[PDB]
Amino acid sequence: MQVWPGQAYPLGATYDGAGTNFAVFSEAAHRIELCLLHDDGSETAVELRETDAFVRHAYLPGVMPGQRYGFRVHGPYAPERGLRCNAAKLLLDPYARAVSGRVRWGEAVYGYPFGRPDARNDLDSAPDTMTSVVVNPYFDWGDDRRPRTEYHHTVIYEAHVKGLTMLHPDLPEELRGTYAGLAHPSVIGHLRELGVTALELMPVHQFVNDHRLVDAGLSNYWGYNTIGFFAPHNAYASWGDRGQQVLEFKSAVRALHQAGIEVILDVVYNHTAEGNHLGPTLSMRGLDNPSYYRLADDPRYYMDTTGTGNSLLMRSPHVLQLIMDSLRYWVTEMHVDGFRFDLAATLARQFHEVDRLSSFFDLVQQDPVVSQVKLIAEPWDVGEGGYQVGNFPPLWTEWNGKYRDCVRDLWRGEPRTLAEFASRLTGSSDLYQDDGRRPLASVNFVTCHDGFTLRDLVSYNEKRNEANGEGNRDGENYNRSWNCGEEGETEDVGITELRARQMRNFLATLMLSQGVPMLSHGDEFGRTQGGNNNAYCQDNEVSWVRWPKEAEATLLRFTRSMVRLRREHPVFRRRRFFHGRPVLTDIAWFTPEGEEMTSRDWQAAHAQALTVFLNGNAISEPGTQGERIADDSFLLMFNASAKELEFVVPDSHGRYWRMVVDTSDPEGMPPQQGPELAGGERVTLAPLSLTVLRRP
Amino acid sequence: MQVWPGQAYPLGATYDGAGTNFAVFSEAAHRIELCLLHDDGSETAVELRETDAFVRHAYLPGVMPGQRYGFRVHGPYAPERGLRCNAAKLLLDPYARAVSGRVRWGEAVYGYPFGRPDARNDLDSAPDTMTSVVVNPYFDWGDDRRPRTEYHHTVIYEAHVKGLTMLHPDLPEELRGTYAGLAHPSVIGHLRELGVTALELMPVHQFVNDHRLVDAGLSNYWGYNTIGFFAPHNAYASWGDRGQQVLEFKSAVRALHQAGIEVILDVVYNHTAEGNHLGPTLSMRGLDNPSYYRLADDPRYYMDTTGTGNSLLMRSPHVLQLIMDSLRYWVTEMHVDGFRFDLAATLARQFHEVDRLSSFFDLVQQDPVVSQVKLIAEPWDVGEGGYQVGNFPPLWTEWNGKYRDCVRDLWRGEPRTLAEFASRLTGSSDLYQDDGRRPLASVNFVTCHDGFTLRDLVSYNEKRNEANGEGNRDGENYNRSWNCGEEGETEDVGITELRARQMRNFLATLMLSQGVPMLSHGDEFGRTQGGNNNAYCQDNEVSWVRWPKEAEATLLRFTRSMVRLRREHPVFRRRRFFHGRPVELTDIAWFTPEGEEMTSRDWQAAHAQALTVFLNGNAISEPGTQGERIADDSFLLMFNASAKELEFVVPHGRYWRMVVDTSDPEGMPPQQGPELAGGERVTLAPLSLTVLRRPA
Ligand SMILES: Nc1nc2c(ncn2[C@@H]2O[C@@H]3COP(=O)(O)O[C@H]4[C@@H](O)[C@H](n5cnc6c(=O)[nH]c(N)nc65)O[C@@H]4COP(=O)(O)O[C@H]3[C@H]2O)c(=O)[nH]1
Ligand SMILES: Nc1nc2c(ncn2[C@@H]2O[C@@H]3COP(=O)(O)O[C@H]4[C@@H](O)[C@H](n5cnc6c(=O)[nH]c(N)nc65)O[C@@H]4COP(=O)(O)O[C@H]3[C@H]2O)c(=O)[nH]1
């Protein structure tokens, strides 16, 4: 038999050489039973009797990795009390390091009769449920140098595990769309060729194909609907789901870490794949409903702060413990370099309000494992006071959703005051400066997985989510986009070259900006999604990354060479805001004709032209060793006008500035040199074009 | 000036091989300078310029360990807002891994002019102040097996580092009263001889003798008045103060851990040694006052839920981080095994009420370093809603204040504490069963550092603290004690035996009571504080532990034999609660002195001071380390707190053996006894105990 009492910590199934020590949390269970599934669907149940601080535990020697296991909570069923415990269902371990199988959708996985939401389901769950697996924690990272690339050298590349590699004509068939293929040399090379220093992996926690999707012809692609917070996703693993998916991810990191490539993965802690009531009872519903999920004034129904069914209680210690244990386990055992938190406002909702003194923030700021890895937050959620951009604690880094909306409104041509675009270029002073932050707190991005891609952003006015199954009712409605004259694809040479160069504008404005640049995957080649902007369920050629074999490889070498500029020239990645008001003047703003803009020229309604001077000799920032940082002085000239404009170079005839970037050109100016301008001489600059000059 | 920007983590002086990095937090400091002290007192200031998330820092190559340093925080001095920043006072390092020197009490360590509280003082504090020192973290714990003694084997021995060894006629005079003398073989041999598994260490966090106390002829001895949250008290060091005292501690833990004795130390996190205003500016008054201390509804004045000057803000993320970074520093760097939190209800006061969902409770519960060590609490503060015995989370253990009073009462004679004393032997079923805890969650104790020692407990009716300088106003006013005929020293052998046998009565009940016991240092030799019940300032023979050279060595072998009787028989240290009756095995049954099971009427019969308890050694419904069953001889405990003799009956056919008797003056847990029939009547003296041991 061999049922030893074991230990209470750590939570989950841990392989201590000769056996495995199990420990799960439930304060609302009279009895808890542990099931040991075999390869034929037989359950060898064991009662974890030894409770300690509402966590029941036991050590069962002989149990080893590959053991399919799960729990069955004997507890009250009373939605009136908030409890939905059911022994009939096979509950997943929240602390499971690897989950096997898919959810086979049926009336059994749900925990309530399909006609009576307050009755109780007595159907066995195991033959249709996912199944948590014990994992051997061993891995020999030889020299896993965490390439601790600082914020002022970081190029974040948002990408998917599957879409990035799925259609790659260099990975053998098996590896396309897996973690293993993500480690391939032709992808790491591409990533190292493109200049990225951080890789953002769209949700990699094990997530569930939604029932509403499976019974609609679709699947869950993005993966922002998760149940296994410690489990690499089994469907992204070509090495098996019997606890061998973690072996890929670890090896996927080590291969990536060898090339000086960081891994910052996208975490979704705000909600769970169990949805609201009327959803499935899979992992945490049956264990402890009241202290895992945020229930409403009527405990039957669920408080939502994400619009997606449920939301976790951020003040119950066993929920905070699960997230800190989740983060760290991905830091120190998966060697993940950082996290992009999803809708991170919900994580700071202690009772109702968004608190920046909330216990979650208190925890993260102090723990020596998480507080040092790159902490990125999506600074909003769909509750009251949901817009919190510029209110997270000064440790954090935020998605500048105001950079997206301000830049997409500049190149679109709207009367977005230049003084609204000029602080987004300076790196969002108005949002972060008083908070005690630096420009690197702003993660700038012209496009991400949400909204249009880059090609869709310069080709479509309104969304095209008909094929999502919701009558075009999902995604952002107006995306500050402009089709460039005709919506959809078109053979018009004028519309084509305009779109191909509007894209150039977006990537050029992004790199010359201050803070952290971010690229959505595919925009290097011009990835299209056919007007679809919220492709959470488009798991097909719509969201795959097509790979190039001329125009798509004109924009490619353009973008790479634009990254070289930001890298090579530290003026574009400064550690602290310019001031330059009274004395060296580290920034200056002149009009096209060549005079310093005035308070009246600045925010006058219809003005769409700028010249920006960036003083490379006024970087009062020490390097790593107190080394004073130098760089050539640059002259960025923006023309958001519909017309051809005449820009004067405002220094003197004394000196010479060489043009190094010019959006207008069809061959690509960031990868191709050009003429050097006199210094008082007039330079005609095409409509919706950009230009940069360089001088030491 | 080789000054590199350095890192912002961790806070404090860390030695990176080539040099040392300093990082300090202040969110209301415009300019922070790093003063580096020399041996002729001259300073060498350098700006910690690099402000990152309100943590200013720098790294200085070549700066070796032993360097005396400190921060001077230029900022606002305005007590109407709560700011007492003073760039004249040499602020300590809240993360000082060793603090040298002592406070020379003068008008210069005080930050304000003595006659005017809210004015400004520009007196240099440098020489009159302690100094935070850089420490080299190396120490070779070759094979330092943390003796992770279980919870149901612990015997806590609360000791002070100085009194334990200042008067031991075996250490060299160098080592009397220091950390090294605490780990001499003659001491660890005694703790081994006594059977303890834990050494509760009265505060070693480096503290300051109060100005209040030093202009009186006295000196703070206990040390519950702390500034150094990372340093060992330099006045306990025989090896030096320039960072060398940290070695004393690390090597004093190495020795105790080799002989298998754990380290539990007394932490004081609720309050600081700067007290309220009118007091010094040493570490946190001048660093960032409003974010460190819990301020009033008038920022000039300090909230005080402790009565010791001030209280700490348990909601500012950077005070909880200072606690945690301290907590994890004594386990991960100095190999401590647990902490006793003092006034631990103040730690949970997040705003006003004692919140068991306070961030602090959610921080300890989660952290892998601190949730695993022994978490012992003193569950009360003097503030409103202070007494919270039985209300801490289930992860926590408490000093059972309702045990101490109710056993002090019983042997004192009060006609109430029988049904109450019963549960206190049961393990305080009232206070802990429903909370989800075990009998072990209650630290039982009759006497501690507070109140009377055990000899004073039976030799005084009221306090005698005139020597403390507050005219007998401090401490407990009634401590639930009895003088046994005469208060003070007598020679009547009738009283003296009653005292020496009363001392046997508590220790007997303490080692036979369910849960975790605690021994105050010196109650083996019958230590006497001369009636001083609150001796926090008596750093003299009053609290010095007197080592014995006839009666003193009789009670000694009494206690040691009782702590064994706990060890060798697990019933007195059970791991679950009793249930008494299989409604449809009987593991406990209470009998009358007459010899019949009691009745709910006869239980709460007011006039009753006699008892017979049965314990079933064969009905321990608990597993063992390897699923085994626990087996034991069954015991029969006979309490007579009556003023006279009462004939006690054994419940007929079998035999029983008498193992414990308080009455006979040779001491009879080390002295073998007769065999009692099983129906026979037995005479039990007034205020005495008896235990029977037929094997089951
Ligand atoms: N010695 C010293 N000089 C100080 C200090 N604070 C400001 N200065 C000087 O005064 C300017 C104003 O700084 P700010 O208004 O806080 O506005 C600051 C702040 O927004 C940001 N910044 C610069 N360095 C840091 C830093 O290390 N950490 C953070 N968090 N922000 C920084 O850049 C702004 C100004 O950059 P600068 O070109 O440095 O211009 C700074 C610098 O000239 C200080 O505490 N000590
Ligand atoms: N920390 C901790 N404390 C424990 C544990 N088990 C018992 N205790 C405490 O000790 C009491 C004695 O339990 P019992 O003698 O087994 O008498 C128990 C036992 O026979 C049964 N029982 C209670 N819980 C369980 C359980 O989870 N499994 C099984 N099989 N029986 C249980 O019902 C009785 C009443 O249980 P309680 O009301 O809780 O009464 C329990 C509870 O107060 C434990 O695993 N951990």
CSV table of N, CA and C in Angstrom, one decimal, chain A residues 3-7 9-10 49-54 57 315-318 320-321 324-325 328 350 356-359 361-363 365-369 371-372 394-395 434-438 575-576 620-626, chain B residues 3-9 49-54 314-318 320-321 324-325 328 350 356-359 361-363 365-368 371-372 394-395 434-438 575-576 621-628:
chain,number,residue,atom,x,y,z
A,3,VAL,N,1.3,4.3,1.9
A,3,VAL,CA,0.8,5.7,2.0
A,3,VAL,C,1.4,6.4,3.2
A,4,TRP,N,2.5,7.1,3.0
A,4,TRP,CA,3.2,7.8,4.0
A,4,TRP,C,2.6,9.2,4.2
A,5,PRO,N,2.8,9.8,5.3
A,5,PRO,CA,2.2,11.2,5.6
A,5,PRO,C,2.9,12.3,4.8
A,6,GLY,N,4.2,12.2,4.5
A,6,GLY,CA,4.8,13.2,3.7
A,6,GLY,C,4.9,14.6,4.3
A,7,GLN,N,5.0,15.6,3.4
A,7,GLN,CA,5.1,17.0,3.8
A,7,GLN,C,4.0,17.8,3.1
A,9,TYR,N,4.6,21.2,2.1
A,9,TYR,CA,5.2,22.0,1.1
A,9,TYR,C,6.4,21.2,0.4
A,10,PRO,N,6.6,21.4,-0.9
A,10,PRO,CA,5.9,22.3,-1.8
A,10,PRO,C,4.6,21.7,-2.4
A,49,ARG,N,-5.0,12.0,3.9
A,49,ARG,CA,-5.7,12.4,5.2
A,49,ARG,C,-4.9,13.5,5.9
A,50,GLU,N,-3.6,13.5,5.9
A,50,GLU,CA,-2.8,14.4,6.8
A,50,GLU,C,-3.0,15.9,6.3
A,51,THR,N,-3.9,16.6,6.9
A,51,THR,CA,-4.1,18.0,6.6
A,51,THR,C,-3.1,18.8,7.4
A,52,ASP,N,-2.7,19.9,6.8
A,52,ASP,CA,-1.9,20.9,7.6
A,52,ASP,C,-2.2,22.3,7.0
A,53,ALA,N,-2.8,23.1,7.8
A,53,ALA,CA,-3.2,24.5,7.4
A,53,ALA,C,-4.1,24.5,6.1
A,54,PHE,N,-5.1,23.6,6.2
A,54,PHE,CA,-6.1,23.5,5.1
A,54,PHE,C,-5.5,22.9,3.8
A,57,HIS,N,-2.1,16.4,2.4
A,57,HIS,CA,-0.9,15.9,1.7
A,57,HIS,C,-0.7,14.4,2.1
A,315,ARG,N,-6.9,38.7,-2.8
A,315,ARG,CA,-6.6,38.9,-1.4
A,315,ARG,C,-6.5,37.6,-0.6
A,316,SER,N,-6.9,36.5,-1.2
A,316,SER,CA,-6.8,35.2,-0.5
A,316,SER,C,-5.4,34.6,-0.7
A,317,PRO,N,-4.7,34.3,0.4
A,317,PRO,CA,-3.3,34.0,0.3
A,317,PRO,C,-3.0,32.8,-0.6
A,318,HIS,N,-3.9,31.8,-0.6
A,318,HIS,CA,-3.7,30.6,-1.5
A,318,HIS,C,-3.8,30.9,-3.0
A,320,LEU,N,-2.6,34.1,-4.1
A,320,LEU,CA,-1.3,34.8,-4.3
A,320,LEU,C,-0.2,33.8,-4.3
A,321,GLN,N,-0.2,32.8,-3.3
A,321,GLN,CA,0.8,31.8,-3.3
A,321,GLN,C,0.9,31.1,-4.6
A,324,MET,N,2.7,33.5,-7.2
A,324,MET,CA,4.1,33.6,-6.9
A,324,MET,C,4.9,32.3,-7.1
A,325,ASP,N,4.2,31.2,-6.7
A,325,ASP,CA,4.8,29.9,-7.0
A,325,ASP,C,4.8,29.6,-8.5
A,328,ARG,N,7.8,32.1,-10.1
A,328,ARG,CA,9.1,31.7,-9.7
A,328,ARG,C,9.5,30.4,-10.4
A,350,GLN,N,-8.0,44.2,-5.1
A,350,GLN,CA,-8.0,43.5,-3.8
A,350,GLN,C,-9.5,43.3,-3.4
A,356,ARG,N,-2.6,50.2,-6.0
A,356,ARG,CA,-1.2,50.0,-6.2
A,356,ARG,C,-0.5,49.7,-4.9
A,357,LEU,N,-1.2,49.7,-3.8
A,357,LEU,CA,-0.7,49.1,-2.6
A,357,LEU,C,-1.2,47.7,-2.4
A,358,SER,N,-1.9,47.1,-3.4
A,358,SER,CA,-2.5,45.8,-3.2
A,358,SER,C,-1.5,44.8,-2.9
A,359,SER,N,-2.0,43.7,-2.2
A,359,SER,CA,-1.0,42.7,-1.7
A,359,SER,C,-0.2,42.1,-2.8
A,361,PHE,N,1.0,43.4,-5.5
A,361,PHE,CA,2.2,44.3,-5.8
A,361,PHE,C,3.2,44.2,-4.7
A,362,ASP,N,2.7,44.2,-3.4
A,362,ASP,CA,3.6,44.1,-2.3
A,362,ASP,C,4.4,42.8,-2.4
A,363,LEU,N,3.8,41.7,-2.8
A,363,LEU,CA,4.5,40.4,-2.9
A,363,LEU,C,5.6,40.5,-4.0
A,365,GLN,N,7.1,43.0,-5.5
A,365,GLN,CA,8.2,44.0,-5.4
A,365,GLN,C,9.3,43.5,-4.5
A,366,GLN,N,9.0,42.5,-3.6
A,366,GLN,CA,10.0,42.1,-2.6
A,366,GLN,C,10.7,40.8,-3.0
A,367,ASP,N,10.0,39.8,-3.6
A,367,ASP,CA,10.5,38.5,-3.8
A,367,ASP,C,11.7,38.5,-4.7
A,368,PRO,N,12.9,38.0,-4.2
A,368,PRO,CA,14.1,38.2,-5.0
A,368,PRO,C,14.2,37.4,-6.3
A,369,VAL,N,13.2,36.6,-6.6
A,369,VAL,CA,13.2,35.8,-7.9
A,369,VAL,C,12.5,36.6,-9.0
A,371,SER,N,11.2,40.0,-8.7
A,371,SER,CA,11.5,41.4,-8.8
A,371,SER,C,12.6,41.8,-9.7
A,372,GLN,N,13.5,40.8,-10.1
A,372,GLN,CA,14.6,41.1,-10.9
A,372,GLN,C,14.4,40.7,-12.4
A,394,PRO,N,6.5,51.9,-9.4
A,394,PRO,CA,7.7,52.3,-10.2
A,394,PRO,C,8.6,51.1,-10.5
A,395,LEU,N,8.5,49.9,-10.0
A,395,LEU,CA,9.3,48.8,-10.5
A,395,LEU,C,8.9,48.4,-11.9
A,434,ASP,N,6.5,61.6,-13.2
A,434,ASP,CA,6.3,61.9,-11.8
A,434,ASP,C,6.3,60.6,-10.9
A,435,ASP,N,5.9,59.5,-11.5
A,435,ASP,CA,5.9,58.2,-10.8
A,435,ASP,C,7.2,57.8,-10.3
A,436,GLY,N,8.3,58.4,-10.7
A,436,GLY,CA,9.6,58.0,-10.4
A,436,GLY,C,10.2,57.0,-11.4
A,437,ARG,N,9.8,57.0,-12.6
A,437,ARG,CA,10.3,56.1,-13.6
A,437,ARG,C,11.1,56.8,-14.7
A,438,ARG,N,11.7,56.0,-15.6
A,438,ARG,CA,12.5,56.4,-16.6
A,438,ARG,C,11.9,56.1,-18.0
A,575,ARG,N,18.8,56.6,-21.0
A,575,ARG,CA,18.4,56.1,-19.7
A,575,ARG,C,17.5,57.1,-19.0
A,576,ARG,N,17.5,58.4,-19.3
A,576,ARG,CA,16.7,59.4,-18.6
A,576,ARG,C,16.2,60.4,-19.6
A,620,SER,N,23.9,62.8,-20.3
A,620,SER,CA,24.5,62.8,-19.0
A,620,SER,C,24.2,61.5,-18.3
A,621,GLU,N,24.5,60.4,-18.9
A,621,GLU,CA,24.3,59.1,-18.4
A,621,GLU,C,25.6,58.3,-18.3
A,622,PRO,N,26.0,57.9,-17.1
A,622,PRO,CA,27.2,57.0,-17.1
A,622,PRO,C,26.8,55.6,-17.6
A,623,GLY,N,27.8,55.0,-18.3
A,623,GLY,CA,27.7,53.6,-18.8
A,623,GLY,C,27.8,52.7,-17.6
A,624,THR,N,28.2,51.4,-17.9
A,624,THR,CA,28.3,50.4,-16.9
A,624,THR,C,29.4,50.8,-15.9
A,625,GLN,N,30.4,51.4,-16.3
A,625,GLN,CA,31.6,51.8,-15.5
A,625,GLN,C,31.8,53.3,-15.4
A,626,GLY,N,30.7,54.0,-15.2
A,626,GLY,CA,30.8,55.5,-15.1
A,626,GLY,C,31.2,56.1,-16.4
B,3,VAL,N,33.2,55.4,-9.2
B,3,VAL,CA,31.8,55.3,-8.8
B,3,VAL,C,31.0,54.8,-10.0
B,4,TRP,N,30.8,53.5,-10.1
B,4,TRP,CA,29.9,53.0,-11.1
B,4,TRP,C,28.4,53.0,-10.7
B,5,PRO,N,27.5,53.1,-11.7
B,5,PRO,CA,26.1,53.2,-11.3
B,5,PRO,C,25.6,52.0,-10.4
B,6,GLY,N,26.2,50.9,-10.5
B,6,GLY,CA,25.8,49.7,-9.7
B,6,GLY,C,24.4,49.2,-9.9
B,7,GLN,N,24.0,48.3,-9.1
B,7,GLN,CA,22.7,47.7,-9.2
B,7,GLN,C,21.8,48.3,-8.0
B,8,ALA,N,20.5,48.2,-8.2
B,8,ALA,CA,19.5,48.6,-7.2
B,8,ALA,C,19.1,47.5,-6.3
B,9,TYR,N,19.6,46.2,-6.6
B,9,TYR,CA,19.3,45.1,-5.8
B,9,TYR,C,20.5,44.3,-5.5
B,49,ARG,N,23.6,58.6,-7.1
B,49,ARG,CA,22.8,59.4,-8.0
B,49,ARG,C,21.7,58.5,-8.7
B,50,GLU,N,22.0,57.3,-9.0
B,50,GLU,CA,21.1,56.5,-9.9
B,50,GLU,C,19.8,56.1,-9.2
B,51,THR,N,18.8,57.0,-9.4
B,51,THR,CA,17.5,56.7,-8.8
B,51,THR,C,16.7,55.8,-9.7
B,52,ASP,N,16.5,54.6,-9.2
B,52,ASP,CA,15.7,53.6,-9.9
B,52,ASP,C,14.6,53.1,-9.0
B,53,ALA,N,13.3,53.4,-9.3
B,53,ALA,CA,12.2,53.0,-8.5
B,53,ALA,C,12.4,53.4,-7.0
B,54,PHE,N,12.8,54.7,-6.8
B,54,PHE,CA,13.0,55.3,-5.5
B,54,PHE,C,14.0,54.5,-4.7
B,314,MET,N,2.5,48.7,8.2
B,314,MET,CA,2.4,47.3,7.7
B,314,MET,C,1.6,47.3,6.4
B,315,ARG,N,1.6,48.4,5.6
B,315,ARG,CA,1.0,48.5,4.3
B,315,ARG,C,1.9,49.1,3.3
B,316,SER,N,2.9,49.8,3.7
B,316,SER,CA,3.9,50.4,2.7
B,316,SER,C,4.7,49.2,2.2
B,317,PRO,N,4.7,48.9,0.9
B,317,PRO,CA,5.4,47.8,0.4
B,317,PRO,C,6.9,47.7,0.8
B,318,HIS,N,7.5,48.8,1.1
B,318,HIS,CA,9.0,48.8,1.5
B,318,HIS,C,9.2,48.6,2.9
B,320,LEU,N,7.3,46.0,4.6
B,320,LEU,CA,7.2,44.5,4.5
B,320,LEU,C,8.4,43.9,3.8
B,321,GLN,N,8.9,44.6,2.8
B,321,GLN,CA,10.1,44.1,2.1
B,321,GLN,C,11.3,44.1,3.0
B,324,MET,N,10.8,41.0,5.3
B,324,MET,CA,11.0,39.7,4.5
B,324,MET,C,12.5,39.6,4.2
B,325,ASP,N,13.1,40.6,3.6
B,325,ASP,CA,14.5,40.5,3.3
B,325,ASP,C,15.3,40.2,4.6
B,328,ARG,N,14.2,36.2,5.5
B,328,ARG,CA,15.0,35.3,4.6
B,328,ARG,C,16.5,35.4,4.8
B,350,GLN,N,-2.9,46.3,9.2
B,350,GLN,CA,-2.5,46.9,8.0
B,350,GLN,C,-2.9,48.4,7.9
B,356,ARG,N,-6.3,39.5,9.5
B,356,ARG,CA,-5.7,38.2,9.2
B,356,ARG,C,-5.5,38.0,7.7
B,357,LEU,N,-6.1,38.9,6.9
B,357,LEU,CA,-5.7,38.9,5.5
B,357,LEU,C,-4.7,40.0,5.2
B,358,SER,N,-4.0,40.5,6.2
B,358,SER,CA,-2.9,41.5,6.0
B,358,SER,C,-1.9,41.0,5.0
B,359,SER,N,-1.3,41.9,4.3
B,359,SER,CA,-0.2,41.5,3.3
B,359,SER,C,0.9,40.7,4.0
B,361,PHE,N,0.7,38.6,6.5
B,361,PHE,CA,0.3,37.2,6.6
B,361,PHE,C,0.3,36.5,5.2
B,362,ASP,N,0.0,37.2,4.2
B,362,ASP,CA,0.0,36.7,2.8
B,362,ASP,C,1.5,36.6,2.3
B,363,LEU,N,2.4,37.3,2.9
B,363,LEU,CA,3.8,37.3,2.5
B,363,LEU,C,4.5,36.1,3.1
B,365,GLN,N,3.1,33.4,4.4
B,365,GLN,CA,2.5,32.1,4.0
B,365,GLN,C,3.0,31.6,2.7
B,366,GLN,N,3.4,32.5,1.8
B,366,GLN,CA,3.8,32.1,0.4
B,366,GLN,C,5.3,31.8,0.3
B,367,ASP,N,6.1,32.5,1.0
B,367,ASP,CA,7.5,32.5,0.7
B,367,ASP,C,8.2,31.2,1.0
B,368,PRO,N,8.9,30.6,0.0
B,368,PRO,CA,9.5,29.3,0.2
B,368,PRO,C,10.5,29.2,1.4
B,371,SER,N,7.9,30.4,5.0
B,371,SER,CA,6.8,29.6,5.3
B,371,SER,C,7.2,28.2,5.8
B,372,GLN,N,8.4,27.8,5.7
B,372,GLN,CA,8.9,26.5,6.1
B,372,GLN,C,9.5,26.4,7.5
B,394,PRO,N,-3.7,29.4,10.1
B,394,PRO,CA,-3.4,28.1,10.6
B,394,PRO,C,-1.9,27.7,10.4
B,395,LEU,N,-1.1,28.5,9.6
B,395,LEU,CA,0.3,28.3,9.4
B,395,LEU,C,1.0,28.7,10.7
B,434,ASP,N,-11.0,24.3,15.8
B,434,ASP,CA,-11.8,24.8,14.6
B,434,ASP,C,-11.0,25.6,13.6
B,435,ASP,N,-9.9,26.3,14.1
B,435,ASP,CA,-9.0,27.0,13.2
B,435,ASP,C,-8.4,26.2,12.1
B,436,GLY,N,-8.4,24.9,12.2
B,436,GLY,CA,-7.7,24.0,11.3
B,436,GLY,C,-6.3,23.6,11.8
B,437,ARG,N,-6.0,23.8,13.0
B,437,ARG,CA,-4.7,23.5,13.6
B,437,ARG,C,-4.7,22.3,14.5
B,438,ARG,N,-3.5,21.9,15.0
B,438,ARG,CA,-3.3,20.7,15.8
B,438,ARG,C,-3.0,21.2,17.3
B,575,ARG,N,-0.3,14.3,18.1
B,575,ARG,CA,-0.3,15.1,16.8
B,575,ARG,C,-1.7,15.4,16.3
B,576,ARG,N,-2.7,14.9,17.0
B,576,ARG,CA,-4.1,15.2,16.7
B,576,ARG,C,-4.8,15.5,18.0
B,621,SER,N,-4.5,7.5,17.0
B,621,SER,CA,-5.0,7.4,15.6
B,621,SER,C,-4.2,8.3,14.7
B,622,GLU,N,-2.8,8.2,14.7
B,622,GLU,CA,-1.9,9.0,13.9
B,622,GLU,C,-0.9,8.1,13.2
B,623,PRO,N,-0.5,8.4,12.0
B,623,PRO,CA,0.5,7.6,11.3
B,623,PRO,C,1.9,8.0,11.9
B,624,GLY,N,2.9,7.4,11.4
B,624,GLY,CA,4.3,7.8,11.7
B,624,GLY,C,5.0,8.3,10.5
B,625,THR,N,6.3,8.5,10.5
B,625,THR,CA,7.1,9.0,9.4
B,625,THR,C,6.9,8.1,8.2
B,626,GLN,N,6.7,6.8,8.4
B,626,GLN,CA,6.5,5.8,7.3
B,626,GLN,C,5.2,5.1,7.4
B,627,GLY,N,4.1,5.8,7.6
B,627,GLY,CA,2.8,5.2,7.7
B,627,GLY,C,2.6,4.3,8.9
B,628,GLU,N,3.6,4.1,9.7
B,628,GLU,CA,3.5,3.2,10.9
B,628,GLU,C,2.5,3.7,11.9
